[PDB]
Amino acid sequence: MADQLTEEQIAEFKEAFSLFDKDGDGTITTKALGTVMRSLGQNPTEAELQDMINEVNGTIDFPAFLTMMARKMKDTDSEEEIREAFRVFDKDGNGYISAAALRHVMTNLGEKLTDEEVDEMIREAGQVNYEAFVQMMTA
Amino acid sequence: GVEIETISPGDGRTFPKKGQTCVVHYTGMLQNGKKFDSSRDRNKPFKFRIGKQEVIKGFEEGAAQMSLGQRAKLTCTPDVAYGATGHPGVIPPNATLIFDVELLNLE
Amino acid sequence: LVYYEGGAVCTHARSLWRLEPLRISWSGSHLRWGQPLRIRHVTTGRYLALVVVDACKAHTKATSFCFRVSKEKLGMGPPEIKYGESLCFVQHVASGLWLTYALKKKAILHQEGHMDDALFLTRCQQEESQAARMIHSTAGLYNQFIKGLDSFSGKPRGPALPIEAVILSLQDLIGYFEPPSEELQHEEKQSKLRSLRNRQSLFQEEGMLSLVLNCIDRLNVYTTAAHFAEYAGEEAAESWKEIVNLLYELLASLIRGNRANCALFSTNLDWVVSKLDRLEASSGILEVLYCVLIESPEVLNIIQENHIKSIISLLDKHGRNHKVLDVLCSLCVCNGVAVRSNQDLITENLLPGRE
Amino acid sequence: MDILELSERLDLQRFHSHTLRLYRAVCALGNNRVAHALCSHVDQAQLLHALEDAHLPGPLRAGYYDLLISIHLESACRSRRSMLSEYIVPLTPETRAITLFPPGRRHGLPGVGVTTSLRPPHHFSPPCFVAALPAEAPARLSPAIPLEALRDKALRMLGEAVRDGGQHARDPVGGSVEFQFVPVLKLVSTLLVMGIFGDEDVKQILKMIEPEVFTEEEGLLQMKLPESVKLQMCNLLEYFCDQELQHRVESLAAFAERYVDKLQANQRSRYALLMRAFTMSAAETARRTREFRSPPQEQINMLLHFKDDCPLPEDIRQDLQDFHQDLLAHCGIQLEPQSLQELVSHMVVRWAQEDYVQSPELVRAMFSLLHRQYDGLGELLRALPRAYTISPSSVEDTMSLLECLGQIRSLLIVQMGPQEENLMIQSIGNIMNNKVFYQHPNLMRALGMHETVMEVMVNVLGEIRFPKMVTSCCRFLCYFCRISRQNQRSMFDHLSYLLENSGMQGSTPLDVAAASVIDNNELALALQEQDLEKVVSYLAGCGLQSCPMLLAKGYPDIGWNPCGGERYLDFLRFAVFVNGESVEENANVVVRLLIRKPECFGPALRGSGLLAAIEEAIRISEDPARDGPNRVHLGHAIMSFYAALIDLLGRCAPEMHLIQAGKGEALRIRAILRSLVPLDDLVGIISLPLQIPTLVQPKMSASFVPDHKASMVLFLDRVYGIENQDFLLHVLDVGFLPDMRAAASLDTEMALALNRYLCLAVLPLITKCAP
Amino acid sequence: ACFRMTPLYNLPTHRACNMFLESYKAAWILTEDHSFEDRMIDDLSKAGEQEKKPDPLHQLVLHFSRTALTEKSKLDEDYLYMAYADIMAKSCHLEEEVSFEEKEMEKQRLLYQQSRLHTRGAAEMVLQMISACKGETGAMVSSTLKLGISILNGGNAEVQQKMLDYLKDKKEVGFFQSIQALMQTCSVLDLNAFERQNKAEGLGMVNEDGTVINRQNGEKVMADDEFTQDLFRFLQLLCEGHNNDFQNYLRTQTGNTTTINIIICTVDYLLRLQESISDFYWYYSGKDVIEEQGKRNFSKAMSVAKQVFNSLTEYIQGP
């Protein structure tokens, strides 16, 4: 799903891609793919370069370029989302969220979870930490 | 095969130079006489730049061979324009063309 | 050979059978059980004997059949045999041999029988059955007319073919196939059309299209209307001009409107266009080409530049006929879809001469 | 001879009438290369002269008018009428000042004012015949004609005709009242849909219809008209009700950007007051479910509930209802003839009282107009899914997109030839790098773009005529299906048609169907059963016959299909395995159906040894005479096919937690898959050594790959299982420590074909059995 | 991901307007009611009065009859006819402790609006298009049956007498076959898509700012419900006044060539319903309690069962 990127990145990507576009076709060389990411500050080595082209002839087209841009920014946000997800629980922001302050924040979020499952969330997990909570949520 | 026969003389001294535009109120025929084109019916003074080969070769070679305000009858040979195939739909293959032009202004 | 089939040949002209008991008088009395009868195919005119056979070699000893319910060791009529309910078989009255199968399940008189010879009858329809027997009446004349022509097909002249018999027989067929009027009421016009859609599909399926195509191609070879008609003589020579024109009117009356029969000319399209300058019935063939090029759009894009150059050559030798501009107006588009290959073959040929 | 003599010639009138049908039919449906070619034969002035020479006969007047639009005003006509049904409004401040009623409850004039919906310009090109011929040409535009001169002439000929018709003259222009108006309305109607009239011009046109109503002579509607002239009145009036509707939508788009700019500051001030409120905790989260816990789609649904529990103040909740009463009164609901819908509903019904109309076209165009006025609310509703709203910084690329959209719809109606194919590919290749196709996937779905590219794949498949086209279309759909999930939801709906044409190199229509069901539990759960049995019936063919293209290539003969049959199992392994998990309801019905035709399995196990089948493959792959002799080697496809039959059934293995329960159905399947395959056949396959590259590189597509081993390890680790320590250590030294130190040797091409194989297939299975 | 949801003021304003239209139409415009369906049909009927010609309404159903008689294989889905099928249907639903007299005027005003259609030939239009369906259970045969009920609602008599003669002068085999075709394509309770819905019901909100549209999936089990109830409700209303000729017509089309005996065909759907409801018992015969979705399915199947027993007994209410 290519929707996980916001607009201005694609605006920045197309600005970067058209800057190194070969003839305006939207084709670039295999080398220029490395240079254009380092033109965007991203510095992956040839290991992260090699597996991406064979995932998709030396001719990189702009949708074929963009689908690789989705996956490189999908994995990084997938792990940094869950610590800031725990930030709203604890009043301080460290990881010390009291279990008393959970059974009204969890029945009031909008996935329509009733009292039985937020119970079932808890007794199959005092204040619990964050890293056990990112373990008990991802499962 | 660019035969210019005059119809009315112009200035006699002003000639179009290269890198320049012209305005021609032309019309054309075939050797049978059937009028395949005009410009006055479209009420538009047709313009073009000389040298850049926008028109066919028999046209611009006739064009610089005129004076400003002159009226000339041209005769472009088959080999100078639309030689083998001709225009699609309009001009038949190996057709000799007959023109009536007039340099309006601008050299 | 007798066969079986699904539903496609169930409706058509072949699967129509009529019963003929041995007694002459009161033959249309109610048939009862244990009654001897003959079996007639209507289109071929052959008699079923388990093969079908000609009437001249159909004998009461050879072919005489009967309707029995099941083989226990055994004016008008009483109403014995119901419709759709009797479920009775056939066997020979001299042999007792049950006709049964072996998609073409070949029917054979078999002394073992089966559990599947319980077969139910269905009565046909009045307009269809009238259309049936005239096929036999025409094809018996037409193949007689073809081989009558084939006799002197190579031998010049320094039996008599049926000239007057065939002229009247076509003209009834034209009025048989005549399309209904536009001034008719709409609900009845639509009803009469679907009758006509059957009884031209009912002809072109059971032969009668190529059979008409044959008697053209035995006749078209005599382009001199009298000199090459002198292979017959002077008798048939005076009527040669008529018999061609009536023939193309029949064929044009066949494929009018119908899409399915119009695809039957996708193979011999070049057979049609090759006879456009034939100088006899020039309107006739041009009529046939116009009705085929408006019903089935697949015949458009199978046309090359050699065909269009004949049609413009037809217009240049037959005056300013306004029908020729119709067939070129059908050649551009089909079903709201244009053909860019055909829209330039006309233009760079017709227009640029301006003459 | 003079052309007016055709009025009594009556034969060359007809033959010159039917010539005009040939002229309109040749330049028909946007054939614009030939449209210049006719502009020689019938000049520009003599066509404009023939529009008003009243002494022309009957059928020759309706020719020279209809010739004119068919060479000048048709190629632009269809493309703009196509973009009328959709409404794309930008946020300029000119848009921002648009109301329903004009300021001054007096209903405004229809079609008069300012509209802002995007439409492409027309791109006419002037005709010439002395320009030199180049050469494939890109395209030819429609040949031009001066429009600002044309609108004054067309208005004048209408303006006399409504005035001269009141005189009731015995000699009408062109021989009837029918020919006096039908070739002047259908030009004015097609200059009104192209929008080239000024508003003061259509102010005059409103006077010329019924001046008693539309004023800020006798009216045209009161005039007795024959039946066909009523028809063009409907096609004239149908433009006007749409200009009421497109103005209404552009009014509501102007209302919203004034409204949601007022709504965001209300929320962010309310949230900051929520951010400083500590007076409650159990009721605070009931105020916090909306702020960051709900999705923004659910916010607006919750915010807009105050008709008859809303966090909005009474000040900005009433003006919406004040706006809502401004709209129903703008429509036909009085909501307790000086109106357009009052005029039409009078006029159309009175036309039925005039006579018994026989032409079925007019009776459809009447009643469709009449229903449009009475359910004026529902007329607004059905257009609103085609309403979309974009940013004003995106307009400079959006209209560049729409022109590249229009060439496709022009190619919808022409039978495809070898030139416009190169127009279609160059079109599509210019869509997929236009940057707005991605950032608004609702809009691309709203314009029916995903529908349009399907039908041009329909017409080509009906032997393949144009294969280079059909790849780039199905490549576009595969790149379309992963833009948003709901776009994949839409493309899913054409599955049975896509399935009917599974029947080569490059992409395929079937990979469209594969990318329509991937990565989504919703579709995979909703996948039909009848849509499954078609997939195995094409799998029922490949095991019995060969590839006819391969024996045409001079390859050795193999009675089944190691290359063609693998184009279904890669689909079906997306049909039961999603998100790294197996489904249940599809897995329990694919294997019940896969065993009804046991020919669908590979015939070496239908039987020879499974390791022996791959052993039978190594000889025919290493020997070039038994190999296929160029891109297709038979030995590389047989091991690849059995790499597909294995890992499919591994991905239909019921999951472990259902085996811990006593689900007898779920363990019935786990019996069958274990019953089919011997375990020790896998062990010789899992342990066979490979041609490691060193000093030379072997060929990937003719030899053993690590992806052949990757299918087998998934089968044993999902249906057979590693139980005891000895059988763990049984296959351990034989298979992988040969390969591990072969991999540790090269610390290169197949080194990276095997590095990812180890890190994704076996090193998990080791860590499954590490205690 | 439910916690990282961005607020509205962080969004760009054009997307904020987009979800508003999907909301504002959903909560305001769709909810709006109006009664234009009666103030149309009067002036299409009254305008025959002016200063043997057909009425404006009478012209219309003649035109819809003409498009139903042209020979085509399928029946093309016209949106315009469906736009007029419901409007004429709602002309009778306004009338479709009380006194004795006041319900008779509530009855007879329904026979007024029923007369306002079926003297203009509305009875045979709705009889032709069922023969023009030939079994294609699309959206039009939904919208054509709601008109067929609102003419024969309350057990009108002469519309049946306007219908029997039409099936006796035409001998139209093809009606009854299309009747038999729609009968067999009536969904029943399954035991496979039911848990497919239930496994689908385990998801409440989809990732990335999307909502699981529960009406998009809807009821995958027995979405054929209100249609197949409506056909038997139409079929019940053909012998409501115990019109004994239809009791001998619906089992034997004796003028026709081929009988169908819908009475037997009504039995065979009932048997297919009978096992389908019984196997729904055996799934729940082990369970103790019943959840919410289990009853909504079972509420559906008996509501169509009460319709078909009522439609059964009107074949035999007359002796």
Author numbering:
A (entry chain L): 1 to 56, 61 to 129, 135 to 148
B (entry chain H): 1 to 107
C (entry chain D): 244 to 292, 299 to 323, 333 to 360, 372 to 427, 434 to 630
D (entry chain D): 1648 to 1751, 1758 to 1788, 1793 to 1873, 1923 to 2014, 2020 to 2047, 2091 to 2216, 2222 to 2262, 2267 to 2369, ...
E (entry chain D): 3634 to 3684, 3693 to 3737, 3750 to 3972
Which passages does the manuscript contain on this structure?
RyRs govern the release of Ca2+ into the cytosol, driving multiple events, including muscle contraction. Diamide insecticides directly engage and activate insect RyRs, causing uncontrolled Ca2+ release, leading to tonic muscle contraction, paralysis, feeding cessation, and eventually, death of the insect.
The pore is in an open conformation, which is expected with a cocktail of activators including FLU. A masked refinement of the transmembrane region led to a local resolution of ~3.5 Å near the FLU binding site, allowing an unambiguous assignment of the FLU ligand. The binding site is located at the interface between the transmembrane region and the large cytosolic cap of RyR. FLU is primarily stabilized by van der Waals interactions supplemented with hydrogen bonds (H-bonds). It is coordinated by several residues from the transmembrane helices S1-S4, including Lys4563, Tyr4564, and Leu4567 from S1; Ile4657 from S2; Tyr4791, Ser4792, and Tyr4795 from S3; and Asp4815, Gly4819, and Val4820 from S4 (rRyR1 numbering). Among them, Lys4563 and Asp4815 play key roles in sandwiching FLU by forming H-bonds from two opposite sides. Additionally, Arg4824 from the S4-S5 linker is also important in stabilizing the pose of the sulfide amine group via H-bonding.
